[PDB]
Structures are given as C-alpha cells and as structure tokens.
Design an enzyme around this catalytic site. Structure first.
Site, PDB file in Angstrom:
ATOM      1  N   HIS A   1       7.349  -4.367  10.240  1.00 40.03           N
ATOM      2  CA  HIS A   1       6.680  -4.438   8.922  1.00 40.03           C
ATOM      3  C   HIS A   1       7.299  -4.034   7.925  1.00 40.03           C
ATOM      4  O   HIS A   1       7.440  -3.983   6.801  1.00 40.03           O
ATOM      5  CB  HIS A   1       5.251  -3.768   8.984  1.00 40.03           C
ATOM      6  CG  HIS A   1       4.645  -4.012   7.681  1.00 40.03           C
ATOM      7  ND1 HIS A   1       4.130  -5.149   7.348  1.00 40.03           N
ATOM      8  CD2 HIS A   1       4.150  -3.078   6.688  1.00 40.03           C
ATOM      9  CE1 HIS A   1       3.446  -5.205   6.188  1.00 40.03           C
ATOM     10  NE2 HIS A   1       3.304  -3.828   5.875  1.00 40.03           N
TER      11      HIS A   1
ATOM     12  N   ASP B   1       5.572  -7.790  13.617  1.00 39.83           N
ATOM     13  CA  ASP B   1       4.644  -7.319  12.436  1.00 39.83           C
ATOM     14  C   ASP B   1       3.244  -7.745  12.682  1.00 39.83           C
ATOM     15  O   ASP B   1       2.797  -8.876  12.246  1.00 39.83           O
ATOM     16  CB  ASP B   1       5.279  -7.973  10.989  1.00 39.83           C
ATOM     17  CG  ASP B   1       4.578  -7.163   9.943  1.00 39.83           C
ATOM     18  OD1 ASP B   1       3.696  -6.533   9.959  1.00 39.83           O
ATOM     19  OD2 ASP B   1       5.027  -7.360   8.659  1.00 39.83           O
TER      20      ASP B   1
ATOM     21  N   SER C   1       2.883  -7.055   1.961  1.00 42.77           N
ATOM     22  CA  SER C   1       1.653  -6.470   2.637  1.00 42.77           C
ATOM     23  C   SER C   1       0.507  -6.658   1.741  1.00 42.77           C
ATOM     24  O   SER C   1      -0.079  -7.610   1.525  1.00 42.77           O
ATOM     25  CB  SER C   1       2.033  -5.007   2.840  1.00 42.77           C
ATOM     26  OG  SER C   1       1.145  -4.362   3.812  1.00 42.77           O
ATOM     27  N   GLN C   2      -0.368  -5.508   1.361  1.00 43.35           N
ATOM     28  CA  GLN C   2      -1.566  -5.682   0.689  1.00 43.35           C
ATOM     29  C   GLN C   2      -0.988  -6.694  -0.941  1.00 43.35           C
ATOM     30  O   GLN C   2      -1.877  -7.213  -1.419  1.00 43.35           O
ATOM     31  CB  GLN C   2      -2.155  -4.500   0.153  1.00 43.35           C
ATOM     32  CG  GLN C   2      -3.177  -4.664  -0.795  1.00 43.35           C
ATOM     33  CD  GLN C   2      -3.981  -3.450  -1.163  1.00 43.35           C
ATOM     34  OE1 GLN C   2      -4.730  -3.561  -2.109  1.00 43.35           O
ATOM     35  NE2 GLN C   2      -3.653  -2.137  -0.726  1.00 43.35           N
TER      36      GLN C   2
ATOM     37  N   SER D   1       0.855  -1.325   0.067  1.00 41.35           N
ATOM     38  CA  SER D   1       0.057  -0.150  -0.068  1.00 41.35           C
ATOM     39  C   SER D   1       0.914   1.334  -0.065  1.00 41.35           C
ATOM     40  O   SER D   1       1.803   1.384   0.713  1.00 41.35           O
ATOM     41  CB  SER D   1      -1.040  -0.047   1.146  1.00 41.35           C
ATOM     42  OG  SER D   1      -1.714  -0.997   1.320  1.00 41.35           O
TER      43      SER D   1
END
Length: 197
Positions: free
Chosen positions: A173, A160, A105-106, A27
């Site tokens: 993260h 994370d 992530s995303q 993101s």
C-alpha cells in the site's frame, strides 16, 4: 514537491489553464497532496508546462481521518461535499478546461464517491481519473460508479489488502510512488490529449 497546491482556488479567473487536476490524498497525509500528489503534479507540469495545468488538492473540510475509512463509502459526507465543490468550482471558473482527477487510499474512495455524485455534465469533462490503493476496489468491482472504465485507471498492488476488501495497511500500500511518477500521469495526459487534440 509542494504538498499543498490550490491552483484552482488561487488562480486568476481570466487566466484559466486548459487542464485542471483535482487530487485527494490518503489518510493522515500532509497538506492537500500528501505523498503521491506532488509527483503526479510535477510530471503533469513537465508535459503541459507550468501554466498549462492547474494543480488542486482536496483540502478544506477533507481531513483525511483514518477512522472515516470505516464509513459506508470509505470517507465522510463533508469530504464528499468538499471534492464535489472543487469539481463544481473548476467547471464554473474555467468552463473550457478539461478536468483530470486522482486519489490515494481514502482519497481514492473520495474521488470515486464525488465523481459518482457529480452532475453528469460536469463528470463528462473529467477526461481521466487515477486511483491508487483504492479502498473500495473489491466492493465497487474496480470501477467508479457512473464513470466509464476507459477513463479510469486503478493501481492496486498485489498484497495491498485495502484493494481486496479490508482496511489493513501492508507494505504494498506504500509502494505507489513508481506509478505516481510514470504510468499514472502518462494515462492522464493521454486522456486529456484524446479530447483536446
């Protein structure tokens, strides 16, 4: 280095590379590769040679919108269509290529959802997938649906929080750089070689 790569889209059909890497950024990240993708890419190029691997970020309709993490599979339907479409274009344009994939992530959620939904005949060509900061790690029990554990490598740092069921960003993260430069591309190369020789 380069944060936008379209080697599959741009690449001359009659010159397909033996390996095609499709990668989804996190993101709000820049280009179509973000922070980790270019590091994975340069290491893949070191191993395969520049002409031995095509690097393809997930651009187009994948906007890497922060709020889309809250959607059921952790990304949007439009993003899934985009990444599915790149796997499909890879296999159509370059039927003899071995595919490899990744996401952060995303983008890890997007890789997982796209791979889940992909035609099994095309999914079988994905020799390995690396996921960093996998936002659906807890929910999906560390797996990509419809895809074997031995082709999956998840990098989820202690602390994370996205890996343990939330969407809170904490410092671990942001600490996947070492994995992206070392163990992640190494895993992908091992998986490719195990199939191509």
């Amino acid at each position: 280095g380069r944060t936008t790569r379209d080697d599959l889209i741009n690449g001359n059909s009659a010159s397909c590379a033996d390996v095609i890497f499709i990668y989804a950024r996190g993101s709000t990240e820049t280009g179509n590769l973000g922070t980790l993708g270019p590091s994975i890419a340069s290491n893949l190029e070191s191993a395969f040679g520049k002409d031995g691997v095509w690097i393809q970020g997930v651009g187009g309709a994948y906007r890497a919108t922060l709020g889309d993490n809250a959607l059921p599979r952790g990304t949007s339907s439009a993003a899934i269509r985009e990444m599915l479409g790149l796997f499909q274009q890879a296999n159509t344009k370059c039927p003899d290529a071995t595919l490899i994939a990744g996401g952060y992530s995303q983008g890890a959620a997007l890789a997982a959802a796209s791979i889940e939904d992909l035609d099994s005949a095309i999914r079988d060509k994905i020799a390995g997938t690396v996921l960093f900061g996998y936002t659906k790690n807890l929910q999906n029990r560390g797996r990509i649906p419809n895809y074997p554990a031995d082709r999956t490598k998840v990098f989820c740092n202690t602390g994370d929080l996205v890996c343990t069921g939330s969407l809170i960003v904490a410092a671990p993260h942001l600490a996947y750089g070492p994995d992206a430069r070392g163990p992640a591309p190494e895993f992908l190369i091992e998986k490719v070689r195990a199939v191509r020789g």
